[PDB]
Structure 1
């Protein structure tokens, strides 16, 4: 196996995991592949000579695979899915195309909601975020083609699958989960907003994700995420 090294964003102390859902997505992909890999955090104000030479463009995250450097998170993920393949490593792509688009609009709705300071607009932006979360909830609770089995009498027609595409984490989850993590942490801290309990699909999904080391161990600390948003999350005024 060629050497695999992921270079990721460091946090406020220049060493710990920083806020960056792109770095986290790729850490999750590599973990799910079962490949041996290293992960090196990068303080962009205090780069090492090594990092400056590997990637003088300075993009983060970046991947060293053998002696080849890759940038652009989406391209890095496509490369890893192709080159780390069966039989030694599992294919992580979703089977159902809609798994790859469900929930993708949430992060932009969240960003607008937290950056806004116009009080009159706040309830509109909160509703936009709730509606995008509800569309994700409806996807998670809709049975996929691989599910044709009876459901409990109490939850007929409700999918109980663990993750976006089925019972295994896929590339789709590696993209979405780090973004939902930010959404939940930042909205709690700066908007007093919580995902309604009635969004039972979304809450089952997050609970199942947090119980998995691939997601839990690659999350930045809540404090780091809160600090990252401290000067952009605006109070209504």
Structure 2
């Protein structure tokens, strides 16, 4: 069954570019354990093949068998439904709220990073921090699998590695590529780092960077910084 992911190329026309949608599906496919290929597209210099496969030009897209699929959310839903046990793990979260935890962070970041009004900087940095804190509280809330298991010193605190438990799920595949952009960009252009006191978020990121599915699908930091340079530099 042939599976080829087409993804956004970076500044050299070849390496992985900044696209958290590309990276989400790359990670889903890696987690499924299916055999697949990844082909980068320089959208300024498209191949005759890519032009034929996807006239509409959407990116990312997926060639599966002879069918071309577009729309990241739909492509992911398709993959989860078609790549099924026993050959491939189900990657859907068990707890619905894992699928919404921290979904606001990226738009708070986008406002913060596009803002060029100095009087609103602190408001927008607050908005971002508040959204990150709500993610932190999700990551430290025990989930049903952890029911009544603890230690005297950390009662009512979750020990789990990722959003929905100790395995990576589709929820992590959506969130992590975006959280990665937020970190990289805000360090470079805002002097901002996530507070050390968000221990849940910190642990989450520590565990996520330790996983090739996330770590090996990340664009180079440089690609992410270049992608944001024009809109991030406007604030003086």
Output the TM-score relative to the length of structure 2: 0.99
* Higher share in helix: 2
Judge conservation of contact 1:5–1:63 (CA < 8 Å) in 2. yes
Q: Deviations over 1:183-207 (max 9, x none)?
A: 0000000000110000000000001
Q: How far apart in 1 are the matches of 2:66 and 2:152?
A: 56
Q: Deviations over 1:122-174 (max 9, x none)?
A: 00000000000000000000000111243222221110100000000000000
Judge conservation of contact 1:107–1:183 (CA < 8 Å) in 2. yes
Paired positions, count: 236
User: What are the within-5 Å matches in structure 2 for residues 73-152 of structure 1?
Assistant: 73-152=72-151
1:83 offset after TM fit, Å?
0.3
Q: Deviations over 1:59-99 (max 9, x none)?
A: 00000000000000000000000000011000000000000
Output the TM-score relative to the length of structure 1: 0.98
- Structure 1 residue runs of 5 or longer lacking an equivalent are none
Q: How far apart in 2 are the matches of 1:16 and 1:151?
A: 45
Q: Secondary structure at the match of 1:15?
A: coil
- Structure 2 residue runs of 5 or longer lacking an equivalent are none
Q: Deviations over 1:191-231 (max 9, x none)?
A: 00110000000000001000000000000010110010000
1:51 offset after TM fit, Å?
0.3
Q: Secondary structure at the match of 2:112?
A: helix
Judge conservation of contact 1:17–1:41 (CA < 8 Å) in 2. yes
Q: How far apart in 2 are the matches of 1:235 and 1:75?
A: 35
Q: How far apart in 2 are the matches of 1:93 and 1:22?
A: 17
